[PDB]
Design a protein around this ligand. Sequence first.
Ligand SMILES: Nc1nc2c(ncn2[C@@H]2O[C@H](COP(=O)(O)OP(=O)(O)O)[C@@H](O)[C@H]2O)c(=O)[nH]1
Ligand SMILES: Nc1nc2c(ncn2[C@@H]2O[C@H](COP(=O)(O)OP(=O)(O)O)[C@@H](O)[C@H]2O)c(=O)[nH]1
Ligand SMILES: [Mg+2]
Ligand SMILES: [Mg+2]
Ligand SMILES: [Mg+2]
Ligand SMILES: [Mg+2]
Lengths: 188, 186
Amino acid sequence: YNRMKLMIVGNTGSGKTTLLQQLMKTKKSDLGMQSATVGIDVKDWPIQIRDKRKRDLVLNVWDFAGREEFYSTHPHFMTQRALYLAVYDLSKGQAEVDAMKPWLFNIKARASSSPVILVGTHLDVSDEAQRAACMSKITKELLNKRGFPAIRDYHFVNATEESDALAKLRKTIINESLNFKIRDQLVV
Amino acid sequence: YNRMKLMIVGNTGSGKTTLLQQLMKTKKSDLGMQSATVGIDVKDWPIQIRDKRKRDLVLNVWDFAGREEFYSTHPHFMTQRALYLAVYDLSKGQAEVDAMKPWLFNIKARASSSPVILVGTHLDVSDEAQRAACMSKITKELLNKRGFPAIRDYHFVNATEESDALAKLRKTIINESLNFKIRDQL
Ligand SMILES: Nc1nc2c(ncn2[C@@H]2O[C@H](COP(=O)(O)OP(=O)(O)O)[C@@H](O)[C@H]2O)c(=O)[nH]1
Ligand SMILES: Nc1nc2c(ncn2[C@@H]2O[C@H](COP(=O)(O)OP(=O)(O)O)[C@@H](O)[C@H]2O)c(=O)[nH]1
Ligand SMILES: [Mg+2]
Ligand SMILES: [Mg+2]
Ligand SMILES: [Mg+2]
Ligand SMILES: [Mg+2]
């Protein structure tokens, strides 16, 4: 309701769900502490409707646990306190870094104060030419750009297993989450 | 997905998840989800810090499938393209109709034009006097109130099984979705 959100964005199949699964992985990973029920469940309900016409209608259903969860979707909270993971497939080449640009424009517009951590997944199945092209494109075309979010860090990981690289990303998500929350309290 | 959102709201344990499960269990038609993955997945990530005396909260993690799913959470869609299902437990009596008032004020604050369908669950374990007291309270204090959403319909159901009552609610939800881009009152 009040606490900070982590927004994981990128194109479908980039490895967002896989990455989160590994980031949360311990003994107590996904299901742990507090609620006996999911706070917000979002599912499509396709209905072969018949009111006047015989058309097809899909409703995007938001199932809220209670007041705290509904309050958390206030336009203020969605747009404000949020650290963004911008995720892309390293193995599909530097064209995927170009594909992050429209995402960064969309994040800046939606959440003007929100920092971004760039995560390149599929490190294990990328060649060093792809990694070199992606690295150079990030440093020259994405980092410290007026109209883009502040990119606090950028990582290249295999999102399917625990590694030193993933453990560092996890540490960075923690540190950048704590920092952002109370960071830049005033403006001169 | 498609444009219109159905927002199921009320207090924890009122039967929201049970009600939606029964609404979506329609005859014998098999289909599941549109795509291979959940469009928007929201889960709490409890994290523990090495520096103590600063026990942080959980991270509220929003996992978006792609562009269309992110686009769908633009405040314009979340506030102006939302139909509401306001759920309460009838077996807890008229106090739960009172507890809908703060919900209706919060829903009005999101958008003036927000339509609401009221649903009392637990009809199967509710006294006739409980139903009577709740029906009178709705019609007196909730229907056609300036400052509340337009209550297009109110329902009493056993949310755990199929019924003519639940079938009627299903058709109210469909009708209100198809009728959404129409004005309320004169
Ligand atoms: N080899 C490899 N496969 C990955 C990696 N990250 C994701 N994948 C695979 O990419 C596919 C899509 O992953 P998913 O998490 O569903 O992507 P999402 O659509 O962005 O949520 C799955 O087959 C994953 O196992 C990675 O770092 N290495
Ligand atoms: N007997 C009966 N039980 C119900 C009804 N609706 C919900 N329940 C039960 O109420 C409890 C809470 O339901 P749930 O859907 O999890 O509530 P939520 O917290 O509002 O999502 C569960 O034990 C359900 O089986 C109903 O109409 N009749
Ligand atoms: Mg996914
Ligand atoms: Mg945001
Ligand atoms: Mg529930
Ligand atoms: Mg809303």
